[PDB]
């Protein structure tokens, strides 16, 4: 799936001396890369973009609010999400944070990709992604991005890859109506119907809806609420559905759809949840459950 | 639902690409009897191998057991 790449004529007629000296004096005169960011808590600039998260769908459950209404709650789990790489405006063309999640053994990963983690000094992640971030949002390599990055009542934009269903016809892929079951219709109860329009168009359109293998598609659900965050167990409880099956990782970000630059007064820590007293925290061991926050909302039964 | 012209030798060859078989990159060879098969398959005398001399299995000692033969 690539064009024929390069004719690559080698002979430069001896102008190669000028280009080699120009390249040597171009790399050596480029600026030194900026220092390690070393982030502590920072101010909330209104036009500043935060990082995202790689969370794992764990299924759906039932909860009732204090007002007494059932809410469909999916539960996501943050699998040791850390910052693996970094891109910034001086050395790269853009300013981004590269995130990693999960874990894989050394024998289970390709040697070209394992070398990247061994150079970075981070464990071998199973998924690597990146998010565009502002200049003041560059968090250093090795920093965890857990459930505490998000707050209860926040609206997020979850991105997921849909369940695979295989090849289906236009009845359930495009939702087309077919022909009647019993009025003389011959062998065409699930036919797509007319596809072109005769000699004057003379062809089928480039965007025609025809049967195909739907499934595994990157669909984003926009502006979904966060109902509960368990910081100790890395659990976030979104309300509503998340695309994808259970066990597949999904992407999260602050909802840019609801963006007045105020972030709707959500209590978002800007660089990440910079943890104070990181000591006195147990490793995977005999730990217990912790406390969580939740939004309330007003008048779900204001009248009948 | 019907060819309008006759297919050329070049177009026929291009269309017949799905019909060709891929070569296998591994084979399990018995050093004695020279038999050839996959690494996950028995190809000794119990399966089809008229050339088997039993040297393919190099050790099989199991004398002791005790049970009730139902007769």
């Amino acid at each position: 799936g690539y064009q024929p790449p390069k004719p690559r004529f080698p002979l430069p007629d001896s102008i190669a001396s000028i280009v080699e000296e120009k390249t040597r004096e171009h790399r050596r005169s480029a600026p030194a890369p900026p220092p390690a960011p070393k982030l502590e808590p920072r101010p909330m600039t209104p036009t500043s973009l935060r990082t995202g998260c790689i969370a794992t769908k764990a299924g759906m459950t039932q909860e009732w609010d204090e007002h007494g209404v059932r809410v469909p709650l999916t539960v996501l789990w943050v699998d040791e999400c850390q910052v693996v790489g970094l891109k910034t405006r001086p050395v790269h063309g853009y300013n981004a944070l590269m995130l990693g999640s999960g874990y894989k053994r050394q024998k289970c990963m390709s040697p070209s990709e394992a070398g990247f983690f061994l150079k970075a000094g981070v464990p071998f992640k199973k998924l690597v992604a990146e998010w565009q971030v502002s200049e003041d949002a560059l968090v250093p390599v090795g920093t965890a991005i857990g459930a505490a990055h998000y707050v209860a009542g926040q609206r997020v934009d979850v991105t997921g890859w849909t369940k695979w269903k295989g090849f289906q016809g236009v009845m359930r892929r495009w939702g087309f109506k077919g022909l009647p079951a019993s009025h003389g219709v011959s062998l065409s109860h699930r036919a797509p119907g007319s596809i072109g329009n005769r000699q004057d168009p003379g062809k089928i359109w480039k965007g025609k809806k025809l049967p195909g293998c739907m499934g595994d598609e990157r669909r984003t659900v926009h502006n979904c609420l966060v109902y509960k965050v368990d910081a100790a167990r890395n659990l976030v409880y979104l309300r509503g559905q998340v695309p994808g099956p259970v066990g597949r990782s999904v992407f999260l970000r602050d909802s840019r759809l609801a963006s007045p630059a105020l972030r709707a007064s959500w209590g978002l820590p800007f660089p990440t949840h910079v943890p104070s007293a990181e000591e006195l925290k147990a490793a995977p061991a005999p730990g217990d459950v912790s406390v969580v926050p939740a939004p309330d909302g007003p008048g779900v039964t204001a009248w009948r | 639902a019907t060819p309008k012209k006759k297919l050329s030798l070049h177009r026929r060859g291009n269309r017949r690409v799905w019909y060709w078989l891929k070569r296998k990159t591994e084979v399990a060879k018995c050093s004695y009897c020279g038999a050839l098969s996959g690494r996950n398959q028995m190809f000794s005398g119990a399966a089809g191998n008229s050339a088997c001399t039993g040297q393919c299995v190099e050790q099989a000692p199991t004398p002791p057991a005790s049970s009730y033969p139902a007769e």
């Binding site: - | 398959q41 028995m42 119990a46 399966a47 049970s67 139902a70």
Partner: protein, 177 residues
């Protein structure tokens, strides 16, 4: 069209379900009469699952188990073998009473072929592993099995010495009534 492989369930084997259950009953009866049978991979995997179910039912040794096996297992020469030789042979084995070895393809239809045989018998093709593995009381596993509620589960003879002091008694025979 219902999903059987990919959603753990029984194979369809190109047959209606009543034909499918009857064919499996015939094959499990043949598997215990001659202890190694050769068939296609799909029947071989289905036979392995069915053999585990039937052998455990014979291992119960109860009257209801005999009644259920009487319909499941056809021969009656081999209903005795399942309840006596097979039950005593695998009395302490936690499943896995059968192994599968692939044997190539068959001439009539190029279908993949597997050898399916009972393990732990004279005439098997790989040495079995012991069903139990007596624990060292001076190792980590034994202490984990003392702090947590696990039984000893040691290898045992058919009648251990814990019944010897009952059977030795001449006042516990009842003369045979």
């Amino acid at each position: 069209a219902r999903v059987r492989v990919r959603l753990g369930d029984w194979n369809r084997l190109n047959r209606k379900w009543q034909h499918r259950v009857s064919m499996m009953k015939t094959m499990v009866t043949q598997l215990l009469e001659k202890e190694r049978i050769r068939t296609t991979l799909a029947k071989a995997k289905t036979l392995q699952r069915y053999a585990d179910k039937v052998i455990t039912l014979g291992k119960q040794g109860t009257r209801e188990a005999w009644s259920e096996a009487r319909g499941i297992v056809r021969t009656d020469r081999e209903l005795h073998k399942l309840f006596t030789q097979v039950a005593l042979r695998y009395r302490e084995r936690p499943g896995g009473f059968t192994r599968l070895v692939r044997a190539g393809w068959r001439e009539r239809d190029a279908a993949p072929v597997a050898f399916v045989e009972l393990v732990d018998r004279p005439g098997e093709l790989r040495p079995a592993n012991p069903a139990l593995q007596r624990p060292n009381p001076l190792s980590v596993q034994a202490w984990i099995r003392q702090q947590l509620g696990q039984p000893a589960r040691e290898p045992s003879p058919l009648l251990p010495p814990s019944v010897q002091q009952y059977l030795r008694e001449e006042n516990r025979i009842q003369q045979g009534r």
